[PDB]
């Protein structure tokens, strides 16, 4: 069973530089391509970010044109989400997921991801 868990959540003003942590035990996190998710309150599940195993490609959704970047930690097989320039509409709990073997390419569906984590409740205030 994969102990997929996330941490690093607190209230902050717009533009605070805060990070995430995808923890993956059990299966492989080194080879898989993965994505990040949230359950917006009053809305539906929407995509956050994605990466391939060796960080040779990235992809994101429409409203994250300059606020997001996806990069990998190799010591604990974690993927960061260095995010800044916050908007008060971004409050949600962030979930990193799991995919089958990917050679190269980007996918964003909330349900395309077989496994989901515990999450981190990110929040924004003016």
């Amino acid at each position: 069973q994969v102990q997929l868990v996330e941490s690093g959540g607190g209230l902050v003003q717009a533009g605070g530089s805060l990070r995430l942590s995808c923890a993956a035990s059990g299966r492989t996190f080194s080879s898989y391509s993965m994505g990040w998710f949230r359950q917006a309150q009053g809305k539906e599940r929407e995509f956050v970010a994605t990466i391939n195993g060796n960080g040779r490609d990235t992809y994101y959704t429409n409203s994250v044109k300059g606020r997001f970047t996806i990069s990998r930690d190799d010591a604990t097989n974690t993927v960061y989400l260095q995010m800044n320039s916050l908007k008060p509409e971004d409050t949600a709990i962030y979930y990193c997921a799991a995919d089958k073997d990917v050679y190269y390419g980007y996918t964003s569906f909330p349900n395309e991801y077989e496994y989901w984590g515990q999450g981190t409740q990110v929040t924004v205030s003016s």
Binding site: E44, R45, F109, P110, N111
Partner: protein, 49 residues
């Protein structure tokens, strides 16, 4: 509805690579022309210096 009940358009490419005329190809870019300077020359037919 949710993303789980909204239509997804899908087109998937299948590549028929078998030895034959192979008339489909990607575009090839050209370097600008130099004159009177010893240069490596590359052309579709052959390369050389």
């Amino acid at each position: 509805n949710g993303v789980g009940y909204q239509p997804y358009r899908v087109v998937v490419l299948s590549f028929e690579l078998l030895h034959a005329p192979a008339t489909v190809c990607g575009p090839k870019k050209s370097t600008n022309l130099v004159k009177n300077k010893c240069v490596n020359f590359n052309f579709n037919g052959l390369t050389g210096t």
